[PDB]
Structures are given as structure tokens and as C-alpha cells.
Design a binder for this molecule. Sequence first.
Ligand SMILES: Cc1ccc(NC(=O)c2cccc(C(C)(C)C#N)c2)cc1Nc1ccc2ncn(C)c(=O)c2c1
Ligand SMILES: Cc1ccc(NC(=O)c2cccc(C(C)(C)C#N)c2)cc1Nc1ccc2ncn(C)c(=O)c2c1
Lengths: 251, 252
Amino acid sequence: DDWEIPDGQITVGQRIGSGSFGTVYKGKWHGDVAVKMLNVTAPTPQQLQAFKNEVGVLRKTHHVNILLFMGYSTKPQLAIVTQWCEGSSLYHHLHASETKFEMKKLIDIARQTARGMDYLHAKSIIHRDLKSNNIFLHEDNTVKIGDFGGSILWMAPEVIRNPYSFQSDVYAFGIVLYELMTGQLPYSNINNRDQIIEMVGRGSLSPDLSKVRSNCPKRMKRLMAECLKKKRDERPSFPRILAEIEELARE
Amino acid sequence: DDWEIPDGQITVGQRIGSGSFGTVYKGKWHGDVAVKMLNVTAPTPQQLQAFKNEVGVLRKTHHVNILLFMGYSTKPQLAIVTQWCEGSSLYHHLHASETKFEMKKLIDIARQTARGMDYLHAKSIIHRDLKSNNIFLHEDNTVKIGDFGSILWMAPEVIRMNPYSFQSDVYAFGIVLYELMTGQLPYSNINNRDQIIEMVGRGSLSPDLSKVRSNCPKRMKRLMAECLKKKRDERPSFPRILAEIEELAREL
Ligand SMILES: Cc1ccc(NC(=O)c2cccc(C(C)(C)C#N)c2)cc1Nc1ccc2ncn(C)c(=O)c2c1
Ligand SMILES: Cc1ccc(NC(=O)c2cccc(C(C)(C)C#N)c2)cc1Nc1ccc2ncn(C)c(=O)c2c1
């Protein structure tokens, strides 16, 4: 691969977010790009190491449902560059908007999400923060998985109490399925954070699966259940998860 | 960090086309993939080295309008894998289809095509076969540039014998603009190809820009003209080409 970007080529536009590592600016570089940037005139090794490692994982990714990693610049500032994403996240479309999706579109999102996730785990990568907030509907058609700039509902029980695993991401994908099939965040009636955190971690509290749509296929409900099994070992793997969802789509 | 894909991970079938050296299969690998394979023949040194270089450049490309490179396989056979492309090429949509595009989409395609090309040339890459056939409308919205003779896109200096340069690609992009802005293949009225080959090289034949669509903005007429200018040196560069297109689009 060739990942280093000539330095003076990037021009930063409107600041968008504060990111998880640096401030994020919608930029322009041979088209529309997004740039997470650090604006310190000289980077502390902490700041430098997060950069060095954040690039290290992205160096491995090449999938249509994973966000596109385009390169990095070291010298104007420590910067990471990716494609710009036209549209809104999965989170916004279900919760922060009136528009409900068609059941077909609902599974299609779950499908593409599975493909991106399957590919990630295949290259031995752990997301550690799968949520509808970190799932972007590029052009309202294509699912793009990333890490953008507080995730509690998608947290597996063993994470509440090396707890991050492939199975912890699987569970997180389960919660996302709930969002798609209910249009809702789990534990909507429980108010207090410590109550949810403790009840879900102790193994008493599990998402109310009766709220699923009528149109939701019975088989889809079963898969969603398996993903949310309290015992991490008893959770399915994304190969089978991807498998089942696609066979559903063909019908 | 390492792009080679272990054998039996990919499940092939649904072949689309077949060269004299290779075949393309709609595959399955963590989703929908496309696989170019060399299962037509034991690789000749040309094709085998062409393979080696084809991967070497794809390793370097990282763009939304450039085709997505996902990896390669050595052990079942020498294979290259990319994203699957949903839709049909620009060629098919303009000429081999009923669908006429809204002028907006013509510019959007023209802009995304420029972006992909600009990125390519920036990394010091020459395409050498820009045509509407090698431009794929993924999901009918997003342009994907790849490589899948064809002479309507052939620059004058290429007919005669570098000859292949960035300026030869610009001309080829010019013809594509003609396709987009006329809904037509150039010299549609001229019958025999052999006349065209000589005249385009000789300076006799020039695209008829009167066939341009009514909706086409004046700035587009000028840019399209400049791109297919006989003099290769005075031909614009894609940075400068892209520049006009974006600000043109920005005013709509
Ligand atoms: C600009 C950027 C650079 C790097 C990352 N990094 C990650 O997402 C990350 C860091 C570590 C691991 C992963 C994995 C591979 C685990 C995933 N998924 C991802 C995010 C971003 N944010 C980013 C990227 C594109 C965007 N398009 C449109 N809009 C409006 C945005 O807000 C936006 C934000
Ligand atoms: C499977 C494959 C692998 C590699 C390449 N190679 C190139 O495009 C190529 C070869 C050399 C240079 C370049 C560059 C980098 C210059 C560009 N652009 C590209 C093409 C393909 N063909 C390919 C890829 C996706 C497809 N989706 C839908 N349909 C229906 C297709 O026919 C199809 C074909």
C-alpha cells in the first residue's frame, strides 16, 4: 500500500465534531473528504501514539461497508483522512427523525452491517464501540461502519462488570438489531443509569423483545435473541450471523 | 497490512465475462465481491507481470470514485478481488439504455469522474483507457473508475506514434464529457472507422459540439472543448479541470 499523503495538499473546511482523538473538519482533497485533526503545534507522545495506532488498524481495512481509509499526513499536523459521508447515521434516521424504514430496508441495513462486521472480525479487529451512532448511511443506501465523536445500551454484560471480544461486538450487533426492528432504544422505561447498568450487568435485565414489528420475520427475531445471550460463550459468530441474514434476504 | 486471501475463503461462480487470459466471477467473500481470475491459461510472462503491476497500483489507490481493491489470491489460482458494482456502466446508461439523465446527474458524474481521475494523476498514475465502458455507476449514483481497441476516446497524439501521457487521458475524459453532454457517441454520423482513425490524428475530424444538449452550461462547453484540444501541451490538467466543475456545480 501507499498511505502517506503529500503534506500541503489538504485544505480544511467547516469543523464538524470534536472526534474521539482530535477535532474533525470536513475537508477537500480530490473531492469531499473528512479529516480528524490534532491542532497542537507539537504533539505529546500520547497524542502521537493514538495517531500511530489509529492508522495501524485502518491500514488493514478494505470493505464497502467499512469507512474508506484514504491516508495520513504527519507534518502540517497529525491528521487522518477518510472519505466524506453524505447523509445521516443509522441512529438519527430511526430516533431523531420521523421517517420509518421499510422492513426490506431494515434488514438490508442489518445485512450490510453484518458484512462490514464480519470482515472486521475476519482481519482480527475488535470494534469495541458498535452502535447506531457509529453506523453511517452513506448516500442513504450504503452502510458505512466507523468510529465517530457515551455508549451504554450496546454494552455486553461482561463489559459492565480483557472483556472486549468478538462476542462482545456480536452482542452489540444484537442491540443494533433491536433498534432496527423496534425503532427504539432498549430499557426505554428505566430512568436511572446506575439501575440499568447494574441490572443488565447482574444478568437480570434483558431487552424487551415483544416490541418487535409484526412484519419482522420470525427467524430474524431468533437470531437477534442469540446475539443477546447473557453468557458470552453462548453467542453466535458473525459468519453464522452474516449467513442467516443473507439467506433471509434472498427470500 | 497483508492483502493475500487464503484459499477456499472465496466462493466463485456467476461468471460475467471471459478474456483469453482471464475470467470474472460474481463471488462471495464477507459479502458481494468480484474476482478476476487467470483460469483460462497458464500465465504468459506478459499477463503474469501485468498481473503483478495491476495489483501494485491497486495497492496504492484509496478513493471513493476509484474501484475498491480488496485483495488477491495466489493458491487456488492467480486472482484479484474487488467490490461488486451494482448497476451498469456509463456507456450502457447513455447509449445502450432508454434512461436519459437529468443535467444535474450529468454534472455529478462529470464531477465524480474528474475527482477519481484527479486522484489517479496525483499519485502519478496513467489510466490509458478512459471510456464510458470503464466508468461504473455503482448504486446508480456513485461513479466508480476502473479498467475492465476502443478508439473514439483515442487522443490524436496516441493515434500517431510517448504517446501515452496524462494529456492523453484528459482528451479521453473530454470525449466522456461529450457522451454526457450530448447523450451521443462522437462521429455517430461518420460510418467507417478507418476514416476516423486518420482524420482524428490528422486534425480533419473534430467532435461536433452543436450536438450538445440545450441544458448544458456555457462553462461546460469551454471546458469540454479545452480537454479535446488537438495540442496536447495546451490541454488542461485535471486539478484545473476539477476546479471549474466543482464551482460550476456549487452554484446549483
Ligand atoms: C474523519 C475520521 C477519521 C477517522 C475515523 N476513525 C474511525 O472511525 C476508527 C478508529 C478505530 C477503529 C475503527 C474501526 C475499524 C474499529 C471501525 N469501524 C474506526 C473517524 C472519522 N470521522 C468521520 C469520517 C467520515 C465522516 N463523513 C461524514 N460526516 C458527517 C462525518 O462526521 C464523518 C466523520
Ligand atoms: C474483478 C476486477 C478486478 C480488478 C479489475 N481491475 C481494474 O479495473 C484495473 C486494472 C488496471 C488498472 C486499474 C486502475 C487502477 C488504473 C483504474 N481505474 C484498474 C477489474 C475487475 N472487474 C470488475 C470489478 C467489479 C465489477 N462489478 C460489476 N460488474 C458487472 C463487473 O463486471 C465488475 C468487474
